[PDB]
Amino acid sequence: GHPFVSIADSILDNVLNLYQTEDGLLTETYPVNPDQKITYLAGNGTLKASFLWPYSGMMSGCVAMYQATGDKKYKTILEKRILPGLEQYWDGERLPACYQSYPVKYGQHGRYYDDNIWIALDYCDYYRLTKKADYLKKAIALYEYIYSGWSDELGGGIFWCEQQKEAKHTCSNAPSTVLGVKLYRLTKDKKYLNKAKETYAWTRKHLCDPDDFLYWDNINLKGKVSKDKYAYNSGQMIQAGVLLYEETGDKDYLRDAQKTAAGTDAFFRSKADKKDPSVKVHKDMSWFNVILFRGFKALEKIDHNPTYVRAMAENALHAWRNYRDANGLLGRDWSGHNEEPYKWLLDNACLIELFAEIEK
Template sequence: MKNNRYILLSLAFIALAVNYVKAQLPSYNTRIKLLYQQINNKLRDSTEGLYYETSDKAKNENKHSYLWPLCAYIQAANEMEVIDPSKDYMQPVEKAIDQYYTDKLPFAGYQASVTKEKPDSRFYDDNQWVAIAYLDAYNRNHKKRYLEKSEMICRYMLGGLDTVAGGGFYWNEGDKSSKNTCSNGPGILVLLQLYNITHNKAYLNTALDVYKWVNKTLQAPDSIYYDNIRLRDLKIGKAKITYNLGTMLQSNVLLYHITKDHKYLGVAEGIAKAGRKYFFKKGRLPGGYWFNAVMLRGYQELYKVDGNKDWVNFYQEDADAIWNTERDANNMLGTKPERSLIDQAAMIEIYARLQELK
């Protein structure tokens, strides 16, 4: 009897302690404001209208950030505007991204580094992430430039689509050694969003072709997605990363909305269950905040359809753990001494999406 009473008291104490810790956590809105402030304080070059890769300039490869962290930050800026439409968070990031533009033939697009600083490679996925953020913005505010830039990016990315290995987009314009889920999942999303806006059937048909190719070529038996196919020998790179699952999860939900075919919703739910089981271990998601932010996009879309809180609760648990255990004295997040732009942007996106879901 005493042992049972002790166990019950212990469980009650633990529950009280957990609730106390949760009560002490700042709101998602507060966390977003703190992170946004530190990006402007420590990671923005206001003179050039550009951003730094990390807070330690001595460790940065370039004077200013690669485009990839700005892919995260432009989406984060969009999500901040979702929860606070009175502000214009996107414009300064958009102006920075404009400095990566190149009209190099055969199609204009954005390169990996600031154009005036050095010539660099162009990656199809970098361009696609920007287009996804711009299309999300266009669906909110109908600013024409966001649609026009997204259509420009789509023309660029379609230049990276062919029938080698059966189909799919390349990853790097200048290196045709692989086709990756990270350039095909977001490519599908760009095409589906453009179809929703323009009703041009060619966008939908191409999206379906790429969707079928990814599922045939790069989906594992457990419904998680592999990373890439190497083209010289068709060997599959079997790394499993959260963002690859996220884009394909979101693609299925969008296809459900477009076609009204419940098979896509069933596939989405299967992918979501597999992803949560595979990636969420001991109360945490794997490292890589931005990869996880992209995966949240898919879970958020599914949650809006079926209202299943399982798709949200584990993200809340991980996001709170990050704030509690991976935050420095300046309220910047990360696991390295130097704090990176992509990490701060990713967590802004995650907290903003969780705020919206509340």
């Protein structure tokens, strides 16, 4: 069943009301910070919209809600509001064409290979739900751009930022593997399955820590590995492993997924909760946890181990009941320890997908 769809529905309507701009976009935060700083870009005046990354969480949420409920309300929100808003980021001037990080009416802005993977993944899922030709075409066109980010440097792998090609990242290779499997299922073209297998093998060899089965962040062109461990990176390799096991029957992919998942739960579900210090909470930001939930939920369907999905769903519901602000919005920390007066769009948009995905 879908016990928390009412919560996900409430967040969607509240975010749309509070964050909407007159030109059909969404602000970076609520309330707006006049001195807004953006710390997540590679390496001007006032901001008038959000960047692509937080905006994209609205598409994952709306698609998840349409999948969970079948309610045309969510199809209408995507067709009339979210997808026309997303088009304001489409840069067809620099090639291959893709969605750039900030609206095109504000000039040229950085283009990220990974931003385009998350959108291509939602286009795959939304095409499966509607059969509208345009969505499959967008997903195939986006894949071509994503793979224009691949090179033989370091034996393979995809870059992160098209304008600053300095390293090959787990965040640009692990969801790329998931994307390949999804495109193989929709088109039956073996080229997608072969590239998914090759991208997975490259990432496992160079970016998986052999001591704990957790994924490192990236490897630069000089061969230096950045060993920072984030929940979404291990989470996408769990989902990639499960999907590749479903496609090949090769148990090594399942075994990888189970080892990374056990190591992930032990390492990330380690932060003391504010209200009840005896409860362990996922330490990473809200959106990284929602991406990890895709991997845990995928594995649970195979092995029926509910440990990881139950514990994270409990963490999110606890935060929902206790740490919302006056505007009914949440910050990035589900342990409730960090006060954020200006609530990031993504910290709330990601909850629409999460509460739509909890099945209990």
